[PDB]
Amino acid sequence: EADLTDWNLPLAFMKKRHCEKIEGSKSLAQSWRMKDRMKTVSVALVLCLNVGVDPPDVVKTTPCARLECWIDPLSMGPQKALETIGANLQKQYENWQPRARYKQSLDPTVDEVKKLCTSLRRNAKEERVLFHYNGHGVPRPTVNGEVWVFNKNYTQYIPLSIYDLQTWMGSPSIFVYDCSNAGLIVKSFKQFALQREQELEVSMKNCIQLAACEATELLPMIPDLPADLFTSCLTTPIKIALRWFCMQKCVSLVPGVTLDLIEKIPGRLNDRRTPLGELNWIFTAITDTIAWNVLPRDLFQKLFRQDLLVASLFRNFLLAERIMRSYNCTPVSSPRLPPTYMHAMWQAWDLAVDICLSQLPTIIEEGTAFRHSPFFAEQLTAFQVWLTMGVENRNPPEQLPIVLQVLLSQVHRLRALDLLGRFLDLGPWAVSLALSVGIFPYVLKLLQSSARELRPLLVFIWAKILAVDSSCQADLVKDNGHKYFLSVLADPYMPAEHRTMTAFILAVIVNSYHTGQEACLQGNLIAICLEQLNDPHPLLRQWVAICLGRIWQNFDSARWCGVRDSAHEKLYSLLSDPIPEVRCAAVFALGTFVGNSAERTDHSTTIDHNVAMMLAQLVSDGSPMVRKELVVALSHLVVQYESNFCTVALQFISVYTQIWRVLLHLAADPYPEVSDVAMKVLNSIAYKFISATVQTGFCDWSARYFAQPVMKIPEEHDLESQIRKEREWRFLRNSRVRRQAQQVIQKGITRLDDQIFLNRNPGVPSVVKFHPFTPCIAVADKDSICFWDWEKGEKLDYFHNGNPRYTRVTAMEYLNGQDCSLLLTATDDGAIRVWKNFADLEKNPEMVTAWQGLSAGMVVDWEQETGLLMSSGDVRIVRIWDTDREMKVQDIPTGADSCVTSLSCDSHRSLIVAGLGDGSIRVYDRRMALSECRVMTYREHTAWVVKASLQKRPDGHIVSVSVNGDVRIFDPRMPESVNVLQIVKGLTALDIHPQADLIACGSVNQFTAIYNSSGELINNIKYAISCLAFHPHWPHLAVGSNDYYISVYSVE
């Protein structure tokens, strides 16, 4: 079939730079940054235990509750118990916040508490201070808002108003209450704060409160549980959770587990490899998970991330809520947390605890090896399952804090890094969520590790982080992790992709950030990048060049280092790099290097002139984006030498003169954006401020690549995609059209006189081309390009070429005609431009790319298969532009004084045929060397060659017709004509069809003679007919007379 030919056709000018507009992606407001870091400098432990005396308000049962801070007061005597409990509680708090001044008040007085609060406030005026209260030994707080304490002789309970308490305290502080009616305390505290706010007109959010029970509720008195239940939950969450687990009916699912066994559990809270440490780590991860899932982001950041003590207290407070719910007690917090007793993660907590402690009998008695719990492995597996199909912006996975927690250790660190990087590849929203959850400090700490296996995962993660947020450069420089990235980049064994990502990380680190600039200058970055400059990777070369340019951005030290390393000379190669992206990166580097001379020696003057001369020969560059970067570099040159350029400008009203001529060429550019930028830069010269400097968005546009996902399969490969199905449908239609045309040709050619329609155009039709498959005919006028239809018969679009009045659109072509086609417009002066969305209902004219060529009119002969583009005209050279590389590949000499009136080429072979005004028709083969490109030179005409077309068949025949109107059929393997014919004395235009040998001739007398190659008479249609065209498949002919009338003919 003919489908494979369509499939293996490069799509010229169809890439990211062409489709997506060049510009920087707007940076979102990154609010993940921590506003402030508070510290709990001091802790106050007021213990109104009143050992040995029961408060009159409650009559405790005979067994009652006797465990306070895991100490039985009655065993060791009253005062010794009070001191021991105070010391134990201090130790319990030190477990979470060791670095704090702990002062214990044991049955204190009002003056004693006042002195303590004043002293602690003086010690820490602007920092949080913890105030712990345990009113087990005093009557319940009154509705008035008072807390009972002891007098000196311990015979009467002297109240203490909460208003006075908060008066002694400052605004930054946290309070923990453990009493039956702490709800009353909380309500009174809030009411007094409201009273203070009312008084202030003519310290609410800052204060944090934790309460054991609601106002009405009373503390549980079950003998099994400790009396100091809320404080035990806030201090020993693992111990209290294990004890609470060992009491529920779930114990029936693991027989042989008893409180004594729980007491003799092995391991410490610090060694995570031990059972107790494993349980603590799992508990922390689960509570953090619940907090992140339930609480809003702002409150979560404010509570569970601000400081270690507050975060730990609330992480334990969630367990406190769950445990106290079963005993008709609702712990209260000043920021009202939504209930978390029903969250599904607590079921996972119970399952993990059951699995972990089920091995305890064998651990204690038999002494088995503690096998690590599979909790983290299962959670990471769930995260992987979510990632497998979590492309859509659905609910965020519940395991992000789990990934954060598992990142801390080493057992699953590698897998966690892999999954985290995969998650970050999803997009900027995913990276933002990973930053909000609090991954930045830990992913920064990973840089200290020397494990080489961590380097690729770390660079991938950090590349995504920097692509989203660029403020991380400061923290990276402060941590000195750029040495880690430099070592990564200085490893040839490392894959080129990771090296490219490391180069990007360094580039964003040094992006307009002086400290990073000099740090990397000290870091041998210039030499490292020069060593990794010629790597066979376009992306790596582009980003290395961008980084090199950014390093010496207004940095004379980096400029001097590059001078010593001959960085400019080494970068001269990249200006000839086939990839326009790499060329643009090199041009940006050269311009930035030029821009920071800062009036150095004559050596600097000479090297600047050398770089300017090297950048001057890139004027004939196909890529307008590259030319725009050329304008930027020359703007750097202009700002360096403003006085000299002003003198040169005033001279006309030898280096700067050549640069100014180059700038004139860039000003007279077909691309509107390039021309506008160049004109503005030149206009800045005449009126001679800094505001005239303009920076292109190329660097951020390239940076957006890492923002976009990379790991996933590309859309084009997708077999079931709508775009692929649409392309297949178009290919099917193209095959059907080709087959039907073949059938019509095989049936023969009948007389063609039908007139589908007759319309009038505003301007003279210069040249007409038909789209091979879609029913769109392109007719170019002097100042407009009409796009008509031969089926609906309506005007679709009306373009404006934009060329000056003197110039004219000579020839046209349909690039990528098979699908996603473009339009080529080549003016007689040299301006070649590409049009997209020319005949679409919901899209407007779009200009893909444009570039001045060369520098009869202009002659073009597009070759889709090879992708090569050739322009010919008055110049004595035929250039071969390659659309893939956007460069001129060959410039074959024509060897003729006359202009090239017509040009054609043969597919699969190099048989470039070029007619000439003098009459001779030369043929050139590009396979051999330039001086030997010319193969044959026959001369049998003395007139402008109207159309020297060539047949696509292997036996190519050059049907040459001049103004004399005589037909001569030459061949590429013969020195003489094979057939000679004379048709019309005065011929104005002609057209031929490869499939059907119909030589369509015009006439001044309105005659339209359609003959064959052998010269047989077929049709002489009766109406300066300067435009005829034939459909590549159908036997359709469009004829345009001197009048602006357009017609389309068909063979019945």
Binding site: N270, T284, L308, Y442, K445, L446, S449, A451
Partner: peptide, 9 residues
């Protein structure tokens, strides 16, 4: 910090 990180060299 908020969480203790071990085994970082």
């Amino acid at each position: 910090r908020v969480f203790f990180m071990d085994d970082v060299e």
